[PDB]
């Protein structure tokens, strides 16, 4: 239990907004029994350069809590234990099909201003909760923006970004503007580049043959699309096992790049789909 106290008296509109906002994950860095206005939420970091991946890294470092039982200016945050059941109100604009794993993502800046809190040069920046599929999708897009923006053209950076950025998952359009192009993608691409070099050097003889053998036997239309992208074996089988194991491990590494740690596992969903129950903590 972490009690928050803002030291500043809030109005009835503020207590109505927090009553609307009850049962939401808020991350804290402090790990004390007491927190205040300075450490609550994500505003004490989102003034430093506003970089999405920077917020993502420190948000990985943060310690997550659940809002509970606001008694006026005092604000209970439960520290939720491992694998126990907890009720979460959602903020991500999604339809939230049950049983999927959930991660915790930096807030994608919508054009409309937030109505959560703005009080005395301090807002309540709440990070969103998303499914792991669209989380990995966003991380793919981050890595891809760096792969393209290491390459340099004039009036083509905008041509890549405006086509790529607006994505749709479960009838929801989101976008990520103003990428600073830091070297974050360069390191997290550099180990990918290393691993793709290893996939090249360690990939077996069966597999790139397996394309041509599959195509020369039979054909399918998605195989013809893969062909568009494309354009003796005398008992070496333990070597083949080892090479396929190495290629699989490189794919595990590049998957561990774009993967985000699942923070929640959904069991029951309300019909309004504002609150859902989970049984997980990392």
């Amino acid at each position: 239990t972490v009690y928050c106290t803002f030291d500043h008296k809030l109005s009835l509109s503020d207590i109505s907004t927090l009553c609307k906002l009850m049962n939401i994950v808020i991350p804290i860095p402090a790990h004390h029994h007491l927190i205040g206005s300075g450490n609550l939420g994500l505003y004490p970091i989102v003034s430093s350069n506003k970089d999405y991946v920077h917020i993502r890294n420190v948000l990985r470092t943060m310690v997550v809590t659940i809002l509970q039982k606001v008694e006026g200016n005092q604000l209970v945050l439960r520290k939720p234990m491992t694998g126990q059941q907890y009720a979460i109100k959602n903020t991500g604009p999604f339809p939230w099909e049950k049983g999927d794993t959930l991660t915790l993502i930096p807030p994608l800046s919508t054009h409309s201003e937030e109505k959560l809190l703005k009080l005395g040069d301090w807002e309540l920046t709440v990070p969103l909760v998303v499914p792991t599929a669209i989380a990995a999708e966003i991380n793919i897009r981050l890595l891809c923006i760096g792969l393209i923006a290491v390459h340099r053209e004039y009036n083509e950076m905008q041509t890549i970004i405006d086509e790529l950025c607006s994505i749709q998952y479960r009838d929801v359009l989101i976008k990520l503007p103003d990428i600073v192009n830091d070297k974050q993608s360069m390191y997290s691409m550099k180990t990918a580049c290393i691993s793709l070099s290893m996939i090249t050097a360690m990939a077996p003889d069966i597999v790139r043959t397996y394309i041509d053998r599959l195509t020369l036997e039979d054909h399918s239309m998605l195989l013809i699309k893969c062909q568009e992208l494309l354009s003796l074996h005398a008992t070496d089988i333990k070597d083949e096992l080892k090479k396929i194991k190495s290629v699989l491990t490189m794919i595990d590494q590049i998957n561990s790049l774009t993967n985000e740690k699942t923070y929640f596992v959904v069991c029951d969903v309300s019909a309004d789909n504002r609150m859902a129950t989970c049984i997980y903590k990392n």
Partner: protein, 251 residues
């Protein structure tokens, strides 16, 4: 009454546990064996830190003199003739209740704090001082740290040499930990990007990290162990909620 700790009774021949029959709280390793009568055989952390490459020659020969008999010589030969290390030996837990019979009985804790019974003198994990390092942005950041064990290999032109590291970090996230470990380990990593192609031994990575569990920041204390007068500097974690997780490899 109440316990809530998870233990396992253990039979192991008494030759391998030479100082670890005296100082409670040690990491233990499962070593499966193609010999069918001892299918599993249990290995001391210091016993495998013998042929770890991190350990300097003085500490290595000192604990080799703590670790010289015929049975240990044969087991070290078996470990060296194993191709890789990390899935022929394996992490198993923390020592409590040495019995020292003929074939000695060991309790071993999977989860929870390290205590036999009656909850007097709750023991702690004992790590050799050479074999750990804390790569982090700020050391001992705010509060309690997660303790991980990392196996790292090295290749000096003949064979593979394994190396045993222990990291202590405030980061819980395994992705953040492997991202700071690649920054620590990049040099020998590029050496293995050279090596793993020309190698034919069935391995696929540079090392792997696995969580032991929680510690406490104010419960880290220095000291030494001594068996037959061999003073050996150790850093003793005091109260440990043992929380094993999966192995996470990195290349």
């Amino acid at each position: 009454r109440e316990n809530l700790r998870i233990a396992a009774r253990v039979f192991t021949p008494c030759e391998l546990l030479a100082p670890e029959l005296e100082n409670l709280g040690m990491l233990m390793y499962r070593f499966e064996t193609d010999v069918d009568n001892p299918k599993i055989l249990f290995v001391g952390l210091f016993f495998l830190c013998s042929n770890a490459f991190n350990v300097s020659a003085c500490v290595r020969t000192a604990l080799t003199t703590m670790y010289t008999n015929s049975m240990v010589d044969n087991v070290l030969s078996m470990i060296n003739t194993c191709k890789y290390l990390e899935d022929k030996v394996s992490l198993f837990g923390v020592t409590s209740l040495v019995s020292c019979g003929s074939s000695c009985l060991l309790s071993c804790v999977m989860q929870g704090n390290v205590y036999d019974a009656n909850k007097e003198n709750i023991h702690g994990l004992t790590v050799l001082k050479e074999i750990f390092l804390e790569p982090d942005w700020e050391p001992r950041q705010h509060s309690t740290q997660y303790v991980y064990v990392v196996h790292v290999y090295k290749e000096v032109l003949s064979k593979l040499q394994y190396g045993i590291y222990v990291v202590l970090t405030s980061f819980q996230n395994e992705d953040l930990v492997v991202d700071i470990l690649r920054q620590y380990f990049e040099k020998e990593r590029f050496l293995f990007l050279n090596y793993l192609i020309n190698s034919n031994t069935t391995l696929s990575y540079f090392g792997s990290v696995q969580r032991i569990g929680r510690c406490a920041t104010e419960d880290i204390k220095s000291g030494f162990l001594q068996y037959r007068g061999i003073t050996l500097p150790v850093i003793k974690l005091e109260n440990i909620f043992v929380d094993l997780s999966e192995k996470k490899v990195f290349v």
